[PDB]
Design a protein around this ligand. Sequence first.
Ligand SMILES: Nc1nc2c(ncn2[C@@H]2O[C@H](COP(=O)(O)OP(=O)(O)NP(=O)(O)O)[C@@H](O)[C@H]2O)c(=O)[nH]1
Ligand SMILES: [Mg+2]
Length: 177
Amino acid sequence: GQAIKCVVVGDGAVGKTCLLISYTTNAFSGEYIPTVFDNYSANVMVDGKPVNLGLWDTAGQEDYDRLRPLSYPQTDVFLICFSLVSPASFENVRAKWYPEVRHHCPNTPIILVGTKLDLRDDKDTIEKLKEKKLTPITYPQGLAMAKEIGAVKYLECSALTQRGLKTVFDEAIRAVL
Ligand SMILES: Nc1nc2c(ncn2[C@@H]2O[C@H](COP(=O)(O)OP(=O)(O)NP(=O)(O)O)[C@@H](O)[C@H]2O)c(=O)[nH]1
Ligand SMILES: [Mg+2]
C-alpha cells in the first residue's frame, strides 16, 4: 500500500549497505565494496498498516558530494548513520551529514542510527581504539547527538547480529505514517 522513500547517508564504511542487505535479505559479508548508488525495497507491516519501503543507499565517500543530493528530492525520511566505533564518523553527523541533508531537505524527519553495535562494548575493540586515544560512542552520547541534530529518534543496531535492526526501519516508517 503506502510508498515511503527512505534515504540512507553517512560516512564511507559506517555500514550503510550492510545494514540494508542484512535487513532485506538476512545476509552479512565482511567484505567492503564501496557503494556508487543502490536501491532496495521491502514490503513491511507496521502498527497494522502495509508499507512499500523504498530504500536509497547512497555513497558515503567525499568524491560523491556533488552527486549525492540528486537522490534527495521527495525523501520521506532520512537515516543518518555513524559507526559506534568511529568517533570521527560521529562528529561528521553534525559537521557534514545533518547540514547537507537539511540544506536540501529542511523538514524531512531524520533518524540517527549508530551502527556496528556488536563492536561498541567489545573489550578488544575498546583497547584498540584507546591506543589512538579514542572511545566508542555510548548510548547517552548518541542520544545527545540526536537532540543536537533534531532527530526524531536515536537508534543503535548491528547488521552482523541484527540486534536493534528491525526497530531502525519500524521507527523510520513511524516517523512518516
Ligand atoms: N562488525 C561489524 N562490521 C560491520 C557492520 N556493518 C558493516 N560492517 C563492516 O564495515 C565495512 C563497511 O560496510 P558497508 O556497509 O559497505 O559501509 P558503507 O557505509 O555502505 N560504505 P560506503 O559509503 O562506502 O558505501 C565492511 O567491512 C562491513 O563488513 C556491523 O554491524 N558489524
Ligand atoms: Mg555502501
